[PDB]
UniProtKB/Swiss-Prot annotation:
Binding annotation for K(+): I87, V90, A93, G94, S98
Function: DNA gyrase negatively supercoils closed circular double-stranded DNA in an ATP-dependent manner to maintain chromosomes in an underwound state. This makes better substrates for topoisomerase 4 (ParC and ParE) which is the main enzyme that unlinks newly replicated chromosomes in E.coli. Gyrase catalyzes the interconversion of other topological isomers of double-stranded DNA rings, including catenanes. Relaxes negatively supercoiled DNA in an ATP-independent manner.
Lineage: Bacteria, Pseudomonadati, Pseudomonadota, Gammaproteobacteria, Enterobacterales
Signal peptide as annotated in the record: none
Consequence of substituting E35D: 7% supercoiling activity, 16% DNA-dependent ATPase activity, fluoroquinolone-induced DNA cleavage normal, 40% ATP-independent DNA relaxation, binds ATP normally, complements the N4177 ts mutant
Name of the protein described by the UniProt record: DNA gyrase subunit B
Domains: entry comment: Consists of 3 domains; the ATPase domain (residues 1-220), the transducer domain (221-392) and the toprim domain (393-804). ATP-binding is cooperative, and both subunits must be wild-type at residue 103 for supercoiling to occur. Non-hydrolyzable ATP analogs (and ATP-binding) induce dimerization and enhance ATPase activity. ATP hydrolysis induces domain shifts that are probably part of the mechanism of DNA cleavage and rejoining.
UniProt-reported outcome of changing G141V: Resistance to coumarin antibiotics, decreased ATPase and DNA supercoiling
Provenance organism: Escherichia coli (strain K12)
Family: Belongs to the type II topoisomerase family.
Residues bound to ATP: D66, G94, V95, G96, V97
Subcellular location: Cytoplasm
Name of the gene encoding the protein in the UniProt record: gyrB
Transmembrane annotation, as ranges: none
Oligomer status and interactors: Heterotetramer, composed of two GyrA and two GyrB chains. In the heterotetramer, GyrA contains the active site tyrosine that forms a transient covalent intermediate with the DNA, while GyrB binds cofactors and catalyzes ATP hydrolysis.
Region annotated ATPase domain, chain positions: 1-195
Length: 195
């Protein structure tokens, strides 16, 4: 279990184009955002009047936040770690957010679910500690922030607002019930897509 997880993530770094697309022309880099957004849209669609927030941070990390159910935090018996950790680290649990985690120098997960805030940090897909309770909340949802690995992504390594805005406008149109916010903390640029 311990070694298959490290191997599944290793397999993604060994053949990254097969999982995320071109790692040199900016395709793969922006696909990283699209993969997390697709998970948030899928959650948004599972509910009513849900909202997704996509933030380009000033340090060229991206966060994707939904106000959905929250990824489950209970122990997954096969692995003996939180379901959230399994979803983030096990390739076989639509390539999945585990690809983004494998190709991220750092990833931060914050889940709001069943009265509690839960947080976990990853480096190159490796958890730094078990998912932990950091406090109380009556909000629900999932926030993923990721810093793409420059051991994978070459040449085009800076996120382009217009590439994210165009995809999110398409996704707003195709999912007319979902609110999508895009925020660029590098310059204060902000858009709200809601059909
Ligand atoms: O409450 C449940 O039964 C339940 C199940 C799956 C599940 C959720 C809730 S929320 C969720 N995913 C997201 O909300 C999500 C993923 C990412 Br990346 C973002 Br941003 N939001 N799921 C999907 C899922 C979670 C674990 C295992 C399998 C599917």
């Amino acid at each position: 279990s311990s070694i298959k997880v490290l191997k599944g993530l290793d397999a993604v770094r060994k053949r990254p184009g097969m999982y995320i697309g071109d790692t040199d022309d900016g395709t793969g880099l922006h696909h990283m955002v699209f993969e997390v957004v697709d998970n948030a849209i899928d959650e948004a669609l599972a509910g009513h009047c849900k909202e997704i927030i996509v933030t380009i941070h000033a340090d060229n990390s991206v966060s994707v936040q939904d106000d959905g159910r929250g990824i489950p935090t209970g122990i997954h018996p096969e692995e003996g770690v939180s379901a959230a950790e399994v979803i983030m680290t096990v390739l076989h649990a639509g390539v999945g957010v585990s690809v983004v985690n494998a190709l991220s120098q750092k990833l931060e997960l914050v889940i709001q679910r069943e009265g509690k805030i839960h947080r976990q940090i990853y480096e190159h897909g490796v958890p730094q500690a078990p998912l932990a309770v950091t406090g109380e909340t009556e909000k629900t949802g999932t926030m993923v922030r990721f810093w793409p690995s420059l051991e994978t992504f070459t040449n085009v390594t800076e996120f382009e607002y217009e590439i994210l805005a165009k995809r999110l406008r398409e996704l707003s149109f195709l999912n007319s019930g979902v609110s999508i916010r895009l925020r660029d903390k590098r310059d204060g640029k902000e858009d709200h897509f809601h059909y």
